[PDB]
């Protein structure tokens, strides 16, 4: 199964790449597992942006 | 491991160098922002509505690719619904292009003047780029070359 | 300084003559296609010099600046002039001008800039044969 | 939305001393 | 460092690993001419 | 644009082909005239191949 | 902390969890027991170690406190012995069980304003705070501690107490039924040391499957899940079927002699007592809580049963935290951290001027 | 609104469905509408008016062909329509006869003579 | 106020006379789909493409009926 869950994860990177999302490979794996738990994505869209704002406040 | 996936998400977005207490507060930022939405429509149509805006400003085959991948992803739907929200948040050759002088059976077209006009912008961007490079390397050091003494220097601020 | 820049001028005149000579009927089916694939590489060489001339209209160009700009054209026209003279000197028509291009693809294998130009010319010349 | 408001109930009143845009 | 690579690109016997060495040494020289470009432009 | 050279490059290859079709077809008529238009379409150059083969389709009708 | 260090205190059934707000978990965890002469007075570890010739008193046994003096002594020993702090210079946010008594809250507020004389305090529900850690305001948190259990629905934050499902089943009955099944099979699980050993075996080696029939057929056909444990004392008993039957009593209650509803059936009845516009939303952002959620795979079994229970329109999306051991403490740490939430706690001046019963108005 | 959301309203108007149902036809509509957004012919309402009059004359409905001439002036009289050429070009194309050659008649200018 | 209500009258007038031109040309459109089409034609869109869109969706609604 792990060969299939690898390829469906790999095709999902390119649709997040040409859609100009800042998610790299590691945060994409984190977020696809977290959405696989069952959390609503409409709030993840807020937490990723808020973490990236509070990250910019240091630099 | 839902309480740990937020802990590793808080580590990935933390930039590398206090790094031991900033995670402790960034997890509070994650939780304080995760609650505001939860205190308070198909999936592929949101992709098509962006594929349209792709096609209007040129770049046709990229939109034909964005639809091509989501036709294979059916044979998970809540993840692409997360990707379409962060669509504008990201950071800002092939000789087998138009090239009517190569092919097996090329059809009769005659002059186009609309591929050549977008072949001279493809180079106009190049020398407009390498001049803003020499406008942004001229300046970042001359702003240090003219000021008061010890402004741009870190050791004088000690 | 212009003596250092003039090799790309000399490696242009020996390419346009090759395409003008080997576009004649007597040179078979494949040496037609080899002089065919070089002219999309002639197009970019002209486009750089017109853009530099329009930049020279604004006075924001120097002789040192021009010598910095033309560095890729000095390589690409040189590989085309090498292929042009290698097809002319040893008379190469048909399958014999399909062997020599496959040899230069093995000569340049680790650069990946002169390889891609040469590998493009191989697949384009291999179309009639 | 504006064509949805356009489906409103119109006033069919008129005067002689009001010729242009007089609902 | 330009005398060496002017000789080494003219030698076909240097091989596959040294026309690539000659390519890397040229890539480092182009950026030095970029520094000479900005040095001329601020004059 | 150094005096329109990209603008007049795509005409000149097409015109030197049309001039070839002109002066090779001088004097010929009938089935010999379609044979001379067919006597230009063994050209591997696809810009010249797609041109004369389009002119063959109008001549051969 | 730009202001002085805050505090959080959760007086649970099996243990008391204290700490400062914004810390990783409750900074101290001590037992809910005081020791008297049967050293004169001690708390927690010294009392449990010297429990051979002394008496122990449970300040919180089944979510309801047994003695107010024991409650004040447990709070004073948590503030003075567990953390070594001064309670008069620290604000603490306390917890509460499902629908606690107003007189008990008044006595607790009088104790917090008189025996401690702190600057400010707050007291609210526990599963609402664990929900206030779990990402989602709206949803059902099923919290089963050591002496009480509750499936608490939460719609827009303020819980609907008419849909709060109360359950009198916990880890005491779990360890007791496991010990009874082991002694019925023939093991020595009866004594006090055997009860501690059986509770440790139920915490570590016990299993939780998806259903009873498949795991029972597998354990009856072979002994794959039977894992051997030889402790430092040298006792060695291995039983896979007892470990498979220990967590299944939440779905098959008659294995331990229970006549109440199951866990998934309790969540089903809680959704049955819930409103319509919040039904699918409560079924979509429910969370797991309670220290009994330390069983692996039981959350997957609960999510499968919750998907089977409700209709096909909504789904089952259960938040299964692997810090459900300290979920209520993490909740208080999330709650007291916010700067706007500093107005939520009630101070000592309003309490002293208008009685401790003003906590019913201020601490909503 | 935007044209991308507005095309889906058209796909729900012609096909009687919801936007969660019909998504294969909207996928096709984005293909044809996108990459063909810019107007390809020179815009003039006069040529389109003289073709709608010709079409209504051709069906022996000579009375409506000069009622259209009174309806076309009111569009200019009110003046909230910016592109009057496009909507008339569309309404002529979707016209059915209640009851051949066109390279001979008047056609719109190609816009290719200009450097677009 | 007033200038926000005079525009409402001036757009009801045009959405009626465009419907009259639609019915003498016997187009199958009604008052609701025409309001989508005029909105699309305001931003600038090829009528040769949008007309082909409508002539495909109205041809595919019959194969499903």
Automatic annotation (TrEMBL), chain G:
Database matches in PROSITE patterns: ACTINS_1, ACTINS_2, ACTINS_ACT_LIKE
GO molecular function, one term: ATP binding
Superkingdom, natural source: Eukaryota
Keywords: ATP-binding, Cytoplasm, Cytoskeleton, Nucleotide-binding, Oxidation
Segments traversing the membrane: none
InterPro entries to which the protein is assigned, alphabetical: Actin, Actin/actin-like_CS, Actin_CS, ATPase_NBD
Entries under SUPFAM superfamilies matching the protein: Actin-like ATPase domain (SSF53067)
GO cellular component: cytoskeleton
Subcellular location: Cytoplasm, Cytoskeleton
Main location: cytoplasm
Keyword NAD tagged: no
Entry's family note: Belongs to the actin family.
Protein name per its UniProtKB record: Actin, cytoplasmic 1
Species the sequence originates in: Geospiza fortis (Medium ground-finch)
Native organism taxonomy: Eukaryota, Metazoa, Chordata, Craniata, Vertebrata
Gene: ACTB
């Amino acid at each position: 199964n792990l060969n299939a869950v690898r390829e469906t994860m790999d095709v999902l990177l390119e649709i997040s790449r040409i859609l100009n999302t800042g998610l790299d490979m590691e945060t994409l794996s984190i977020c696809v597992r977290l959405c696989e738990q069952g959390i609503n994505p409409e709030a993840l869209s807020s937490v990723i942006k808020e973490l990236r704002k509070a990250t910019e406040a240091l630099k | 491991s839902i309480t740990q996936l937020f802990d590793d998400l808080c580590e990935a977005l933390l930039p590398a160098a206090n790094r031991k207490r900033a995670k402790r507060s960034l997890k509070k930022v994650a939780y304080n922002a995760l609650f505001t939405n939860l205190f308070q429509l198909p999936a592929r149509n949101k992709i098509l509505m962006l594929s349209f805006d792709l096609r209007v400003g040129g770049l046709g085959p990229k939109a034909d690719r964005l639809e091509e991948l989501v036709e294979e992803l059916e044979a998970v739907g809540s993840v692409l619904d997360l990707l379409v929200q962060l669509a504008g948040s990201g950071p800002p050759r092939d000789y087998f292009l138009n090239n009517k002088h190569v092919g097996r059976n090329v059809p009769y077209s005659g002059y186009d003047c609309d591929d050549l006009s977008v072949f001279e912008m493809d180079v106009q961007s190049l020398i407009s780029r390498e001049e803003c490079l020499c406008h942004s390397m001229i300046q970042e050091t001359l702003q240090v070359m003219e000021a008061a003494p010890g402004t741009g220097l870190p050791t004088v601020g000690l | 300084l212009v003596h250092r820049i003039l090799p790309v001028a000399a490696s242009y005149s020996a390419v346009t003559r090759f395409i003008e000579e080997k576009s004649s009927f007597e040179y078979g089916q494949v040496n037609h296609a080899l002089a065919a694939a070089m002219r999309t590489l002639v197009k970019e060489h002209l486009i750089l010099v017109s853009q530099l001339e329009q930049l020279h209209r604004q006075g924001l160009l120097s002789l040192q600046k021009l010598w910095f700009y033309i560095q890729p054209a000095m390589r690409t026209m040189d590989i085309l002039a090498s292929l042009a003279t290698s097809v002319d000197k040893g008379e190469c028509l048909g399958g014999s001008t399909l062997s020599l291009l496959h040899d230069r693809s093995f000569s340049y294998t680790g650069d990946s800039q002169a390889q891609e130009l040469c590998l493009y010319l191989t697949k384009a010349a291999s179309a009639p044969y | 939305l504006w064509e949805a408001a356009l489906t409103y109930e119109a006033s069919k009143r008129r005067c002689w001393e009001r010729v242009g845009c007089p609902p | 460092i330009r005398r060496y690579t002017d000789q080494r690109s003219l030698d076909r016997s240097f091989g596959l690993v040294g026309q690539s060495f000659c390519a890397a040494l040229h890539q480092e020289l182009r950026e030095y001419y970029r520094l000479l470009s900005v040095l001329h432009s601020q004059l | 644009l150094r005096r329109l050279l990209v603008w007049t490059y795509d005409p000149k290859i097409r015109l030197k082909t049309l001039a070839a079709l002109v002066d090779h077809c001088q004097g010929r008529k009938g089935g010999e005239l379609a044979s001379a238009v067919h006597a230009y379409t063994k050209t591997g150059d696809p810009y010249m191949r797609s041109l004369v083969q389009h002119i063959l389709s109008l001549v051969s009708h | 902390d730009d202001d002085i260090a805050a505090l959080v205190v959760d007086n649970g059934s099996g243990m008391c969890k204290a700490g400062f707000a914004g810390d990783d978990a409750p900074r101290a965890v001590f037992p809910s027991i005081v020791g008297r002469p049967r050293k004169d007075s001690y708390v927690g570890d010294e009392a449990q170690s010297k429990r051979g010739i002394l008496t122990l008193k449970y300040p919180i046994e089944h979510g309801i406190v047994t003695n107010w003096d024991d409650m004040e002594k447990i709070w004073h020993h948590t503030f003075y012995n567990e953390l070594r702090v001064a309670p008069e210079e620290h604000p603490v946010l306390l917890t509460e069980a499902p629908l606690n008594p107003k007189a008990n809250r008044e006595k607790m507020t009088q104790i917090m304003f008189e025996t401690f004389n702190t600057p400010a305090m707050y007291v609210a529900i526990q599963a609402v705070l664990s929900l206030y850690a779990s990402g989602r305001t709206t949803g059902i948190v099923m919290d089963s501690g050591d002496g009480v259990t509750h499936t608490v629905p939460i719609y827009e934050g303020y819980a609907l107490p008419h849909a709060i499902l109360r359950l009198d089943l916990a880890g005491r009955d779990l360890t007791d039924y496991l010990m009874k099944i082991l002694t019925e099979r023939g093991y020595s699980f009866t004594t006090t040391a055997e009860r501690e050993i059986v509770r440790d075996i139920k915490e570590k080696l016990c299993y939780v499957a998806l259903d009873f029939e498949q795991e029972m057929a597998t354990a009856a056909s072979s002994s794959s899940l039977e894992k051997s444990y030889e402790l430092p004392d040298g006792q060695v008993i291995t039983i896979g079927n007892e470990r498979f039957r220990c967590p299944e009593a939440l779905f098959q209650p008659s294995f331990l002699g229970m006549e109440s509803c199951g866990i998934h059936e309790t969540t089903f009845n809680s959704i049955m007592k819930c409103d319509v516009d919040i039904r699918k939303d409560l079924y979509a952002n429910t969370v797991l809580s309670g220290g009994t959620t330390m069983y692996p795979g039981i959350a997957d079994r609960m999510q499968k049963e919750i998907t089977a229970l409700a209709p096909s329109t909504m789904k089952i999306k259960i938040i299964a935290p692997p810090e459900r051991k300290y979920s209520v403490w993490i909740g208080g740490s999330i709650l007291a951290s916010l700067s706007t939430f500093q107005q939520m706690w009630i101070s000592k001046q309003e309490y002293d001027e208008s009685g401790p019963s003003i906590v019913h108005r201020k601490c909503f | 609104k935007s044209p991308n959301v507005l095309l889906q309203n058209l796909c729900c108007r012609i096909l009687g469905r919801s936007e969660a149902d019909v998504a294969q036809q909207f996928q096709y509509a984005v293909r044809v509408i996108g990459s063909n957004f810019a107007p390809t012919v020179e815009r003039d309402e006069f040529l389109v008016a003289e073709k709608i009059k010709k079409e209504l004359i051709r069906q022996r409905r000579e009375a409506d062909a000069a009622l259209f001439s009174e309806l076309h002036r009111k569009l200019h009289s009110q003046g909230v329509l910016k592109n009057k050429w496009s909507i008339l070009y569309l309404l002529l194309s979707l016209s059915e006869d209640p009851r051949s050659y066109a390279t001979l008649f008047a056609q719109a200018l190609p816009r290719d003579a200009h450097s677009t």
